[PDB]
Amino acid sequence: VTFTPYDVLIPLPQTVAGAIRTLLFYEEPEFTLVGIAIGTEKGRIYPLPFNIIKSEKFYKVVNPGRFLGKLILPPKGKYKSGYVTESILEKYLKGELKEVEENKVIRILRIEKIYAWIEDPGCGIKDILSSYEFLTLGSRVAFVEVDDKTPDIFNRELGSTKKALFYFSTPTIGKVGEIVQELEKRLNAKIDDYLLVSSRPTAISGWDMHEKKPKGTKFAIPPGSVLFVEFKEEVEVPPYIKLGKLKKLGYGLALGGIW
Amino acid sequence: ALSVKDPTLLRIKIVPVQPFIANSRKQLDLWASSHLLSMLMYKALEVIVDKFGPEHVIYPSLRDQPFFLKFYLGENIGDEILVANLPNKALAIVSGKEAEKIEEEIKKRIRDFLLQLYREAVDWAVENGVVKVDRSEKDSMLKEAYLKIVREYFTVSITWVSLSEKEDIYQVTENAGLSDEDVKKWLKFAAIYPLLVKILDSLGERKVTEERFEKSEQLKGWKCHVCGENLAIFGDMYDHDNLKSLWLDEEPLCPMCLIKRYYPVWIRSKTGQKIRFESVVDVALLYKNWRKIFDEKYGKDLVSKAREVSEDFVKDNMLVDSDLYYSSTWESGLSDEEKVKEVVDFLNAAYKEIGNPPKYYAILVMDGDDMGKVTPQVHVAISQALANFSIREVRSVVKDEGLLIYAGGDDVLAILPVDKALEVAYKIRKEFGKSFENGSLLPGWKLSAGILIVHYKHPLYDALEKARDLLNNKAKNVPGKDTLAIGLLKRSGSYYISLVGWELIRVFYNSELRKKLLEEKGGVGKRFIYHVLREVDTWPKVGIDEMLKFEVIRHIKEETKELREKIYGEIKDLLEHVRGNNEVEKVRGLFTFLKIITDAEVFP
Ligand SMILES: Nc1ncnc2c1ncn2[C@@H]1O[C@H](COP(=O)(O)OP(=O)(O)OP(=O)(O)O)[C@@H](O)[C@H]1O
Ligand code: NA
Ligand code: NA
Ligand SMILES: [Zn+2]
């Protein structure tokens, strides 16, 4: 896929998608906005997973226990909003970090870069936007670079395992049941149990140009939310998977993990 | 009680809480949101009471809840009733068989209840000119689009566990991941109630999360102005301008925010009770009894001049809006003209004699850290105590000093005028302390609070976010907690934060220092505070004590030597009660604090 970073000098996905959508003088679009990432001097960053809680100058990754045959999370301290490096998250997704020093968590738009991942079905976005450019953000201006290289997170070889988690990089729009159900199908597998660790539903609304009024309100699982799953049988957990509504708008980017 | 078949632990949780309250443009909305929420628990609690009665509700202790008195026993209660004393979590002991029925019923009981309010709200809105439309159109307001919003908005989650079950602590402790904490409860060699509860939460949190995401999509159209999230009623039908027209005050309203506007009147009909202050300005003006005195001295006249300006400006010899007290309101933002000058000038003259009007008020949030004191009966006594503290102790403190909105036990939400903020928080803290007879020096029960001082023009939702931030993010991140976090947000946008121990209120009050600042005019050295803060930008080479000593001298004849001793002495005392990892952090905190309580614009 094309990899589009902006240098700036939710409706985040919508804004980005529209922007691209909008750039092309020359309702989802034809192309698909897989997802987006926030950027800083430290590169890409992601909302801190909801199962990582601060304590003792440290953030503890807490894993589920199966109570009454039911997946659950041990009673712990409140979630503290934050961000983590792409480096840290990958460790997380492999269940290979037991904790992160507090200093590392990134409380710090107030933003330096925004990354766009796009599947261009011969819309010729790469060559056209490829021209080194400064483009109008949907007002503010940005510098645009485009690379044909897909991000490392996207290509990872997770093991094949019965226990997988899905971390939502972007707001995913769906009821829990539909999502797991949609999941079961795409992986063509059956899920014995699942636990969703998340904050209260996010209200996402966007403009309808033709109707010329605000779009119907939808409720999305907030980013950083994690879905733990116990499959009936061994499944090759994908590096990432798109779920829920408004996919081509950058929604429903869930990154694969294990536990 | 305690004798039953298949006793089961049942837990109830209601959401959303803070997000709901935050969606308030006015104090009245804020109050309604808090009150309504408690009511929902009550409805939910009714089911258990009907089925088993109060004593089977461990938390909260029902026996004295006014709601309980005035809705289950029809006792007469008075303005006591306005305060929301019911939290959004509860647990009872009940039979296993009837439990699932309880789950269905509560969900339904609240669901039906919300639906009523919407409908009574609909009639109300259309009649009194809130919605301004041909009653023919009324049928439109009851369509599924709007009904669904009301049904779906709140998730009340019910969960339960068998109190009689085959038990292995090895296995039970195992599924929940909590090691190195076994001896106190791993050790049972002579039922696991305390551990049992915590799992319930873990279990409860699983259900609430699923159930709160089962949320239907909405139709296109303009959103409620207050909440900004749900389609404004008639939102689908009209263009924005015309739609703005159907609504009084130009505020289109979704269902869940419409119920908010109606809710106040509904309690009144039910209880003939209303809160004294519908506005923050109403609470702001309490400061120095400034309003009492002014309305009385000039208040009498003020309307006719104002009345002379507009017929619709006021009713009943009373101003419609309290912000009319501020000349600035006249000066600009009004929404025939000669009168303006004399009033403005009239009011400015008024300020001359009495002093300027307070435009600042305080939000007080307090929470109990960290609950509880980890036997079902032991739990009950604690609950009864918490209920007693909340219902009576807190009420007596806030009584007549401002607006007490919510007291769920450990937790509190109050709106106070600046002059009584510190006074009240400390008092509550003490009462809380005595009520558990905790003896210092080394207490817990501990309690933390957040005090946000905001300009009246400041958006309510934001004030609430910040105030909660102070409590959770500042006060409770302090090791040992039991802290008070004060934030002064100024219309300029300048935000000042000070974290302090509780006794600091005590020490500073009754300090000569306070007196000099209070007896500041004729004043104490100006820039005293700026100068000290400047030296704490970095470690004074001289050292902290010297600089203090130094600065104390620069600002303050035989007595002058005696006075500086005291001030320097008093300052040294306070720093003991200012949070901060280092002496430098403490000095800023103390002097930042001084900066706060001494701001002329905040404390005329
Ligand atoms: N009716 C009410 N009016 C005002 N405030 C309330 C009301 N009910 C609860 N609160 C306060 O708001 C808080 C919101 O609780 P929340 O929904 O976050 O669940 P919680 O598990 O208590 O969360 P946390 O403990 O992490 O704050 C409660 O702890 C309570 O103290
Ligand atoms: Na909360
Ligand atoms: Na608490
Ligand atoms: Zn609304």
Side-chain angles (χ1 to χ4, degrees), chain B residues 328-348:
Chain B
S328 68
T329 318
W330 303 98
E331 270 259 352
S332 92
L334 274 144
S335 101
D336 183 334
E337 295 80 330
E338 75 267 11
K339 275 159 212 297
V340 182
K341 182 170 59 193
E342 319 180 335
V343 57
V344 308
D345 305 316
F346 181 113
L347 294 158
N348 306 258

PDB file of all heavy atoms in Angstrom, chain B residues 328-348:
ATOM      1  N   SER B 328     -21.099  44.860  32.761  1.00  0.00           N
ATOM      2  CA  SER B 328     -20.514  44.342  31.526  1.00  0.00           C
ATOM      3  C   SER B 328     -21.564  43.683  30.641  1.00  0.00           C
ATOM      4  O   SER B 328     -21.508  43.788  29.415  1.00  0.00           O
ATOM      5  CB  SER B 328     -19.377  43.361  31.828  1.00  0.00           C
ATOM      6  OG  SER B 328     -19.867  42.168  32.414  1.00  0.00           O
ATOM      7  N   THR B 329     -22.523  43.011  31.267  1.00  0.00           N
ATOM      8  CA  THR B 329     -23.613  42.382  30.534  1.00  0.00           C
ATOM      9  C   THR B 329     -24.324  43.443  29.700  1.00  0.00           C
ATOM     10  O   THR B 329     -24.504  43.280  28.495  1.00  0.00           O
ATOM     11  CB  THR B 329     -24.621  41.687  31.471  1.00  0.00           C
ATOM     12  OG1 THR B 329     -23.920  40.993  32.508  1.00  0.00           O
ATOM     13  CG2 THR B 329     -25.484  40.700  30.698  1.00  0.00           C
ATOM     14  N   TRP B 330     -24.764  44.512  30.355  1.00  0.00           N
ATOM     15  CA  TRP B 330     -25.347  45.653  29.656  1.00  0.00           C
ATOM     16  C   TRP B 330     -24.374  46.187  28.619  1.00  0.00           C
ATOM     17  O   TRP B 330     -24.675  46.240  27.425  1.00  0.00           O
ATOM     18  CB  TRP B 330     -25.662  46.772  30.644  1.00  0.00           C
ATOM     19  CG  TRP B 330     -26.562  46.325  31.732  1.00  0.00           C
ATOM     20  CD1 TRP B 330     -26.197  45.933  32.985  1.00  0.00           C
ATOM     21  CD2 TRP B 330     -27.982  46.161  31.654  1.00  0.00           C
ATOM     22  NE1 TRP B 330     -27.305  45.564  33.706  1.00  0.00           N
ATOM     23  CE2 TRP B 330     -28.413  45.691  32.910  1.00  0.00           C
ATOM     24  CE3 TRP B 330     -28.929  46.379  30.651  1.00  0.00           C
ATOM     25  CZ2 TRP B 330     -29.751  45.435  33.189  1.00  0.00           C
ATOM     26  CZ3 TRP B 330     -30.256  46.123  30.927  1.00  0.00           C
ATOM     27  CH2 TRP B 330     -30.655  45.657  32.186  1.00  0.00           C
ATOM     28  N   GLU B 331     -23.199  46.580  29.101  1.00  0.00           N
ATOM     29  CA  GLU B 331     -22.148  47.151  28.272  1.00  0.00           C
ATOM     30  C   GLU B 331     -22.044  46.457  26.919  1.00  0.00           C
ATOM     31  O   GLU B 331     -21.770  47.099  25.908  1.00  0.00           O
ATOM     32  CB  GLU B 331     -20.807  47.085  29.005  1.00  0.00           C
ATOM     33  CG  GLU B 331     -20.511  48.307  29.859  1.00  0.00           C
ATOM     34  CD  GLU B 331     -19.543  49.257  29.188  1.00  0.00           C
ATOM     35  OE1 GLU B 331     -18.999  48.889  28.127  1.00  0.00           O
ATOM     36  OE2 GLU B 331     -19.335  50.373  29.709  1.00  0.00           O
ATOM     37  N   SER B 332     -22.266  45.146  26.909  1.00  0.00           N
ATOM     38  CA  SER B 332     -22.206  44.371  25.676  1.00  0.00           C
ATOM     39  C   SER B 332     -22.856  43.001  25.840  1.00  0.00           C
ATOM     40  O   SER B 332     -23.037  42.522  26.958  1.00  0.00           O
ATOM     41  CB  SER B 332     -20.754  44.208  25.225  1.00  0.00           C
ATOM     42  OG  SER B 332     -20.190  43.015  25.742  1.00  0.00           O
ATOM     43  N   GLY B 333     -23.176  42.353  24.724  1.00  0.00           N
ATOM     44  CA  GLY B 333     -23.783  41.035  24.776  1.00  0.00           C
ATOM     45  C   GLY B 333     -25.279  40.977  25.030  1.00  0.00           C
ATOM     46  O   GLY B 333     -25.824  39.895  25.243  1.00  0.00           O
ATOM     47  N   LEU B 334     -25.954  42.124  25.023  1.00  0.00           N
ATOM     48  CA  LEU B 334     -27.394  42.127  25.274  1.00  0.00           C
ATOM     49  C   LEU B 334     -28.145  41.373  24.178  1.00  0.00           C
ATOM     50  O   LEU B 334     -27.800  41.454  22.998  1.00  0.00           O
ATOM     51  CB  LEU B 334     -27.922  43.558  25.379  1.00  0.00           C
ATOM     52  CG  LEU B 334     -27.823  44.176  26.775  1.00  0.00           C
ATOM     53  CD1 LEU B 334     -27.493  45.660  26.705  1.00  0.00           C
ATOM     54  CD2 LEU B 334     -29.106  43.939  27.557  1.00  0.00           C
ATOM     55  N   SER B 335     -29.176  40.637  24.588  1.00  0.00           N
ATOM     56  CA  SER B 335     -29.989  39.847  23.672  1.00  0.00           C
ATOM     57  C   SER B 335     -31.043  39.031  24.419  1.00  0.00           C
ATOM     58  O   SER B 335     -30.754  37.965  24.962  1.00  0.00           O
ATOM     59  CB  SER B 335     -29.099  38.921  22.836  1.00  0.00           C
ATOM     60  OG  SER B 335     -29.124  37.594  23.330  1.00  0.00           O
ATOM     61  N   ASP B 336     -35.433  52.668  24.464  1.00  0.00           N
ATOM     62  CA  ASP B 336     -34.844  51.355  24.231  1.00  0.00           C
ATOM     63  C   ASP B 336     -33.365  51.327  24.619  1.00  0.00           C
ATOM     64  O   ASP B 336     -32.951  50.467  25.397  1.00  0.00           O
ATOM     65  CB  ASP B 336     -35.020  50.932  22.768  1.00  0.00           C
ATOM     66  CG  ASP B 336     -34.482  49.532  22.489  1.00  0.00           C
ATOM     67  OD1 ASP B 336     -33.566  49.082  23.209  1.00  0.00           O
ATOM     68  OD2 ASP B 336     -34.965  48.885  21.535  1.00  0.00           O
ATOM     69  N   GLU B 337     -32.567  52.257  24.094  1.00  0.00           N
ATOM     70  CA  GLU B 337     -31.120  52.178  24.311  1.00  0.00           C
ATOM     71  C   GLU B 337     -30.530  53.245  25.240  1.00  0.00           C
ATOM     72  O   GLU B 337     -29.428  53.074  25.767  1.00  0.00           O
ATOM     73  CB  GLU B 337     -30.336  52.103  22.991  1.00  0.00           C
ATOM     74  CG  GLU B 337     -30.598  50.847  22.186  1.00  0.00           C
ATOM     75  CD  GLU B 337     -31.897  50.945  21.413  1.00  0.00           C
ATOM     76  OE1 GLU B 337     -32.814  51.642  21.892  1.00  0.00           O
ATOM     77  OE2 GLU B 337     -32.010  50.317  20.340  1.00  0.00           O
ATOM     78  N   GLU B 338     -31.251  54.344  25.433  1.00  0.00           N
ATOM     79  CA  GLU B 338     -30.756  55.441  26.263  1.00  0.00           C
ATOM     80  C   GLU B 338     -30.533  55.011  27.713  1.00  0.00           C
ATOM     81  O   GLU B 338     -29.531  55.366  28.335  1.00  0.00           O
ATOM     82  CB  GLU B 338     -31.720  56.629  26.191  1.00  0.00           C
ATOM     83  CG  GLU B 338     -32.992  56.422  26.991  1.00  0.00           C
ATOM     84  CD  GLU B 338     -34.115  55.843  26.150  1.00  0.00           C
ATOM     85  OE1 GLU B 338     -33.840  55.412  25.009  1.00  0.00           O
ATOM     86  OE2 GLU B 338     -35.265  55.798  26.636  1.00  0.00           O
ATOM     87  N   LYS B 339     -31.478  54.236  28.236  1.00  0.00           N
ATOM     88  CA  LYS B 339     -31.431  53.740  29.608  1.00  0.00           C
ATOM     89  C   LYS B 339     -30.109  53.071  29.967  1.00  0.00           C
ATOM     90  O   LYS B 339     -29.637  53.185  31.099  1.00  0.00           O
ATOM     91  CB  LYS B 339     -32.555  52.729  29.824  1.00  0.00           C
ATOM     92  CG  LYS B 339     -33.880  53.361  30.192  1.00  0.00           C
ATOM     93  CD  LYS B 339     -35.025  52.417  29.904  1.00  0.00           C
ATOM     94  CE  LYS B 339     -36.270  53.188  29.509  1.00  0.00           C
ATOM     95  NZ  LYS B 339     -36.754  54.070  30.605  1.00  0.00           N
ATOM     96  N   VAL B 340     -29.522  52.365  29.004  1.00  0.00           N
ATOM     97  CA  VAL B 340     -28.292  51.615  29.241  1.00  0.00           C
ATOM     98  C   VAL B 340     -27.281  52.414  30.055  1.00  0.00           C
ATOM     99  O   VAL B 340     -26.767  51.930  31.062  1.00  0.00           O
ATOM    100  CB  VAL B 340     -27.611  51.199  27.916  1.00  0.00           C
ATOM    101  CG1 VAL B 340     -26.356  50.384  28.197  1.00  0.00           C
ATOM    102  CG2 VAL B 340     -28.575  50.421  27.029  1.00  0.00           C
ATOM    103  N   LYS B 341     -26.985  53.628  29.609  1.00  0.00           N
ATOM    104  CA  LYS B 341     -25.965  54.437  30.268  1.00  0.00           C
ATOM    105  C   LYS B 341     -26.183  54.589  31.779  1.00  0.00           C
ATOM    106  O   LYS B 341     -25.295  54.273  32.566  1.00  0.00           O
ATOM    107  CB  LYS B 341     -25.807  55.798  29.582  1.00  0.00           C
ATOM    108  CG  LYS B 341     -24.719  56.661  30.194  1.00  0.00           C
ATOM    109  CD  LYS B 341     -24.425  57.891  29.357  1.00  0.00           C
ATOM    110  CE  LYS B 341     -25.661  58.743  29.178  1.00  0.00           C
ATOM    111  NZ  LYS B 341     -25.445  59.749  28.109  1.00  0.00           N
ATOM    112  N   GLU B 342     -27.363  55.042  32.188  1.00  0.00           N
ATOM    113  CA  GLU B 342     -27.599  55.295  33.608  1.00  0.00           C
ATOM    114  C   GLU B 342     -27.456  54.059  34.496  1.00  0.00           C
ATOM    115  O   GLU B 342     -26.841  54.132  35.558  1.00  0.00           O
ATOM    116  CB  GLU B 342     -28.972  55.930  33.841  1.00  0.00           C
ATOM    117  CG  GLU B 342     -29.375  56.985  32.836  1.00  0.00           C
ATOM    118  CD  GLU B 342     -30.742  57.561  33.142  1.00  0.00           C
ATOM    119  OE1 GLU B 342     -31.549  56.855  33.786  1.00  0.00           O
ATOM    120  OE2 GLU B 342     -31.015  58.709  32.736  1.00  0.00           O
ATOM    121  N   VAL B 343     -28.001  52.925  34.057  1.00  0.00           N
ATOM    122  CA  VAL B 343     -27.792  51.656  34.763  1.00  0.00           C
ATOM    123  C   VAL B 343     -26.330  51.252  34.890  1.00  0.00           C
ATOM    124  O   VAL B 343     -25.819  51.119  36.004  1.00  0.00           O
ATOM    125  CB  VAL B 343     -28.558  50.483  34.106  1.00  0.00           C
ATOM    126  CG1 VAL B 343     -28.167  50.322  32.650  1.00  0.00           C
ATOM    127  CG2 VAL B 343     -28.300  49.192  34.875  1.00  0.00           C
ATOM    128  N   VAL B 344     -25.666  51.037  33.757  1.00  0.00           N
ATOM    129  CA  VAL B 344     -24.234  50.784  33.767  1.00  0.00           C
ATOM    130  C   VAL B 344     -23.631  51.720  34.801  1.00  0.00           C
ATOM    131  O   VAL B 344     -23.156  51.280  35.853  1.00  0.00           O
ATOM    132  CB  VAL B 344     -23.582  50.992  32.371  1.00  0.00           C
ATOM    133  CG1 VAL B 344     -24.326  50.194  31.307  1.00  0.00           C
ATOM    134  CG2 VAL B 344     -23.528  52.457  31.995  1.00  0.00           C
ATOM    135  N   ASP B 345     -23.675  53.015  34.507  1.00  0.00           N
ATOM    136  CA  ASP B 345     -23.229  54.043  35.434  1.00  0.00           C
ATOM    137  C   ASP B 345     -23.901  53.879  36.793  1.00  0.00           C
ATOM    138  O   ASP B 345     -23.261  54.054  37.830  1.00  0.00           O
ATOM    139  CB  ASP B 345     -23.545  55.425  34.858  1.00  0.00           C
ATOM    140  CG  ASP B 345     -22.968  55.622  33.466  1.00  0.00           C
ATOM    141  OD1 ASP B 345     -21.798  55.244  33.246  1.00  0.00           O
ATOM    142  OD2 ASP B 345     -23.682  56.156  32.593  1.00  0.00           O
ATOM    143  N   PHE B 346     -25.192  53.559  36.789  1.00  0.00           N
ATOM    144  CA  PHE B 346     -25.874  53.248  38.038  1.00  0.00           C
ATOM    145  C   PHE B 346     -25.103  52.168  38.787  1.00  0.00           C
ATOM    146  O   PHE B 346     -24.685  52.371  39.928  1.00  0.00           O
ATOM    147  CB  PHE B 346     -27.307  52.764  37.795  1.00  0.00           C
ATOM    148  CG  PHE B 346     -28.057  52.465  39.065  1.00  0.00           C
ATOM    149  CD1 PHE B 346     -29.135  53.239  39.459  1.00  0.00           C
ATOM    150  CD2 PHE B 346     -27.659  51.422  39.881  1.00  0.00           C
ATOM    151  CE1 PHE B 346     -29.809  52.963  40.636  1.00  0.00           C
ATOM    152  CE2 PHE B 346     -28.326  51.146  41.054  1.00  0.00           C
ATOM    153  CZ  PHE B 346     -29.401  51.915  41.432  1.00  0.00           C
ATOM    154  N   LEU B 347     -24.916  51.021  38.139  1.00  0.00           N
ATOM    155  CA  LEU B 347     -24.215  49.895  38.752  1.00  0.00           C
ATOM    156  C   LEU B 347     -22.769  50.184  39.150  1.00  0.00           C
ATOM    157  O   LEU B 347     -22.323  49.753  40.217  1.00  0.00           O
ATOM    158  CB  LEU B 347     -24.258  48.660  37.845  1.00  0.00           C
ATOM    159  CG  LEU B 347     -25.607  47.994  37.581  1.00  0.00           C
ATOM    160  CD1 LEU B 347     -25.540  47.176  36.296  1.00  0.00           C
ATOM    161  CD2 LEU B 347     -25.992  47.120  38.760  1.00  0.00           C
ATOM    162  N   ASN B 348     -22.040  50.906  38.306  1.00  0.00           N
ATOM    163  CA  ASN B 348     -20.661  51.248  38.623  1.00  0.00           C
ATOM    164  C   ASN B 348     -20.645  52.066  39.909  1.00  0.00           C
ATOM    165  O   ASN B 348     -19.798  51.863  40.780  1.00  0.00           O
ATOM    166  CB  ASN B 348     -20.014  52.028  37.472  1.00  0.00           C
ATOM    167  CG  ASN B 348     -20.111  51.299  36.139  1.00  0.00           C
ATOM    168  OD1 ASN B 348     -19.145  50.690  35.676  1.00  0.00           O
ATOM    169  ND2 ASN B 348     -21.277  51.356  35.519  1.00  0.00           N
TER     170      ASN B 348
END
